[PDB]
């Protein structure tokens, strides 16, 4: 019994004999079984006998012989003149849809905090606000063309007044709850909630539609997404990331790994994509905590990041504010609404089509100390209504896997080449300064760069993939991977071929509806195709 | 300069930087499954692919069924589910001929698995559809509810603790004229046909509870067969797959008397699930089990019979709205068979119009096809036979082929003296596959000379077989305590290095990120740091009073000594020989009030935790009460012949008498314990 | 006292009585699995939220007599509503607290302590970059103990850790394994935990094997450093460096007194008979022996009775 | 020896230019590493460590500790008695300051001696 | 002075392995240029090994 044999042994004595097992159909299952056979049979026993008395004579050959010749798989060759550019859709230009704006943001620094100062974000935001003079009377310079703009003006004024009115309190609060006002109620959509009843009473009503089953609009490609990507690959004057330590190294392979990761970290430490990563992590964590803590209040949440300066001083930065609605989240799909306010120095009237979901105000003037003398430039504010998720919060809280992925890609490229030339090629990648890689385009032709540039480019690509997730990206990636493999096979002198080339294309275009990142990727693929076979 | 990373491929080959194409590092935050919209499309399409079959009406359920077997041969290149019994049987016979003794050893190895399995096996897996509540529940709850309902109606045969008895009782249940369901006190009645329908429905697909036990044995037998074939790459994973890809290319490139050509193909199959048919599975099972005892045949043949006549649940329904009164409502699918079609749009209208004949009690009938997943290792076996048919002795011509084939992805290599032979071989393979019920996707396949191909995200260049089929680790905190998280993290990193292809440089940065997260979560920073938390004063005092600062754990102020070479060693054993005597005595003191290769320590604490059955935790109480009498039950399974109450009472009496004799406790409570035991014995007499 | 009064009211309810009366000891592990299947509600976030609260962990009542309520800073270390305590209490204990000798630790965790000795006293060689093919063999990750099979390792563990719950076999044989005597002599007054000791002994004494794609050494020493030696396109060279005779007459009798315990068979006599609880519940009548009853050639001598 | 290094390196480079072998490249890398290690070892050879300062005056320096302790509490008791006896204010403040100074300096000396041994 | 004592360990193994590899390559070649190169190699290896051993003995 210690092994698992006592039960079968005990259930095997039928009086004075021994029976191994018993199992019968005997009933409804018999009738169900008799109806699960090929059409020329009636009983299971006859089918079993026919299967038992089977010998293969000539069946497959005869069936193949009596089959039509229209069923075939003919190969058509893939030549240098075969491929054609992918077709992109046409229509009105596309617009911005990120959670926080990237290229057009400025900061209000508290500069150095005391090294022992660890405090509440509200007072850090207030101290950052105090160091600025130059507010004016706000007014609208670009309307939302959908909604009421005076509500936006009143919301900004109320935020400023409620931030100033802290001093009328006996005790200092830890968090700020906004008053439930008409304009804030309109902005957060607290009075457009449909009411739910049973179908029986509303059977005879009229003007009832199924749902928002409408064909998506088609939009073309603009020139601002390329500008954003260009700016995202540059270097800054801060650090934005400091990693911990590990033990000392002994084995040679540890030395090689340490040198690889040290070069990579030194090259990608000061990039702007790291700032985007930190911004996303902080904002999402704060907003999730506020949603879980306060459930029936209009809470004010600041936008804050931290970094280390060139000289070695800690700094704190402020980007704007977020006002949260009501958060009663039972599952991971429920949506919480909010409104966002951000500072900027970019004039909205140069590219009005980029900002289609925004209302822009003018709030003050800024003094610039650059070069000789002092000059003043206007300051603006961007306001918008949005509501994200509970899952996408967790998605935003994990953005260091982009760093992990970039390091893995670089290491894989090194390791692939280390196997053909059977030596160690990590020194020939980084230390050598005469190596150049094609990573750009210009009216003159194809340009070149250094290893740090390709590292930062890969990191930026990973970050932008994280920030613009959609199924179109998946479909395009798969189909483009297939086409790229076929083109490489052609370039390697291996005489490739295809069975149906029109269908692959048709899939590529049908996965190209509306998103700007996907359209930029398609344009990049077309530009690659025009050079790889010419 | 305008920067785009795609032009990096003009200098680096595609296979060297193919990892730049995959965009994600995890599961994206959106869903594409959809509800009732896609199920109707699936049903309509799988019925479209086999229109020319034979229509019949069920005599035990009352549902239409379609039989496409032995239908007309196809005339175009569109997918067609018209298979022939003769071809399948001949392919199986030739597979048996090529590898003599492959079908008997599997049956003998599977019989002992069948005859010894226990009932606990059904509690492992994902969520399972529950017929007693018309929802989804974890496996344990579903099994418990099914047992409760079964015992309520006189079907008590699973008390033997054997899976086969549970299956016998399920078959007996399926042959009754009345069923009763009591909910905690409603008491609903279900007739024969309604219960039969509810015992054949599939979710939108996890199975039911009356069908998993039969699927398990079939999967076991299929795995046993697949383990003995070299053309199957499914059960293996890792370096074994790399060896499998290397061996076929080595075999086909012997280049003896080199006057012959070689070509390879990367291919996919279109509409895999909705072109299979359970009848061919039944035929395969029947052929496999020749010259075997009859009960084994019945047990292995039960499941395809149930699949051959199954019901598909639609979903939750539709949501409507009004643009004037600010109103919204939900339409269940149970009343979808009779509502007027003026409300819906064009697509939904035609969908509903086409789906109406196949609708019974909110579920549609779907005989011809496999829903989703399931029977993977049997479809692989069916696929491997066509590859086996490519030997010289069976083609009887100049060309011949071989390859390896997974559940849905395949690679094939063809050899011929000229181009015409290669074309003829490809055509014959295509036609033979279409003869059995497998369709090849033309728009997702290409052909080139041998030297480069792909198989399930395993990219093969001239000698390098880099793979990208798995994702990166989590490098986060598990959430048990401050002694179990370190071991889990380092073990995960080590296992990913060993099994997958995680590089050495990436492991170090993963360790760095894990340490950062650990320190932030548990508020344990180094003693010589300016970060202020609630735990800083104690850490600084301990740091100041300590002589050897390299022997303190990371949990309390110490630095980390981990690197690649010592990821397999526990932390305490690693730092043992560098810490002070008093620190050792305090830390490893087995009388603490507080208490994957970890030592006990004072850091292993526990945090604060926050119908059918009247109480759902009734077995657990009886279980936990047992170890208080027999502490060894937590280490190994007990063995005995008596009941639980006998052992408990006997041990209690013995312990009470020994305690009284030793004088540890006075005489007052001895009589009380004796009378309580006598009362328990009296209540047991009923 | 508490356990018997908890058992008393379980049989009061009719539904639990059927379970307690219709279930054999052999089927306890079968019903143990019917617990639940849904708990993973993002454990990392839960732990992060729980560490923010004060008093997040639990301890026994006697902590209030060993740890002061406040420290020199003036911070609360525990609160009264098992009681609730804070991590500061654990740090305080590690800083100030009673000390005990740790001489038994290197004998309970020696399988871990040999690994560090192997790693420290080892030497390294060069690294080669090339391509190689890996094949599969049978590898042993736990070497086990020589002259001991998997059948008697469990017996040894049960005798050492749980002397009162051995039954039938081990209790009727006439022998005594040597290793049992030393294990029982050394671990005379260790108070770590029965379960931890049992797991560690099982890990030390029991051999278990698996399948691995090894391209180098085969011995158990080379398997534990498999993540340091091999790679996708490189290889690193490294050398490690370095109980009397009894019989069952039947079930319990009411004419020979109450049942006894296994550890109280020491007194006994020269052939009396008494009933005892052996294993996990069985009570049987036993008696001392008068002959040898060995397994010598006498079994084969029966062949004279056949083939005349 | 160095001349042998560069000559043999050039010879292997020429040999490898005409044919590629795994071992050839391996020995090339190993020879480069060995030459660098020899150069660094020779750079350490013509400098050594500073053993001259490692054998400085240390003998009696270990024994004047007891001599100083001999006169520590003697002078502290002398100052105590003189402070008790005296009657000016100048002398009183001077002796109080001296007592403080000796307390601090003797504690410093004891701590330094305890740390070093 | 602790790090050098552990590089010394790895240098001896490198020298030994390269000695056997070059000896085998010498045994398996049939071109006078290669044997001249390998003669020069073996001489250099013997000299450098002796010097490293002497320096290692001096360090302790």
Numbering used by the authors:
A (entry chain A): 183 to 716
B (entry chain B): 1 to 184, 207 to 226, 242 to 632, 657 to 671, 681 to 756
C (entry chain C): 1 to 81, 88 to 248, 691 to 756
D (entry chain J): 5 to 121
E (entry chain I): 62 to 121
The article reads:
A switch from transcription to replication occurring at later stage of an infection is critical for progeny virion production and viral non-structural protein NS2 has been implicated in regulating the switch. In this study, we have solved the cryo-EM structure of FluAPol in complex with the viral NS2 protein in which NS2 is dimerized to stabilize the symmetric FluAPol dimers in a highly ordered barrel-like hexamer. Our structural and functional analyses show that the viral NS2 protein facilitates the switch from transcription to replication by affecting FluAPol dissociation from host Pol II and by promoting the transition of FluAPol from its transcriptase conformation into its replicase conformation.
Interestingly, in the context of the FluAPol-NS2 complex, full-length NS2 formed a pseudo two-fold domain-swapped dimer, which was stabilized by extensive interactions between the N-terminal domain (NTD) of one NS2 protomer and the C-terminal domain (CTD) from the other protomer (B and EV3). Based on the EM density map, we could build almost all the residues of NS2 except for the first four residues. Both the NTD and CTD form a similar helical hairpin structure, and the hinge region between NTD and CTD is relatively flexible with different conformations observed (B and EV3). Further structural analysis revealed that hydrophobic interactions and hydrogen bonds are responsible for the formation of the domain-swapped NS2 dimer. Further inspection of the cryo-EM structure revealed that each NS2 domain-swapped dimer binds to two FluAPol complexes, and the terminal helical hairpins interact with the PA and PB1 subunits of FluAPol. Residues K18 and R15 of the N-terminal domain of NS2 form two hydrogen bonds with residue E629 of PA and residue D2 of PB1, respectively. If we superimposed the polymerase protomer (Pol1) onto the previously determined crystal structure of apo H3N2 polymerase, the NS2 binding has little influence on the conformation of polymerase except that the flexible loop between residues 550–556 of PA subunit could now be modeled and stabilized by the interaction with NS2. Interestingly, we found that the NS2 interaction site overlaps with the binding site of CTD of Pol II.
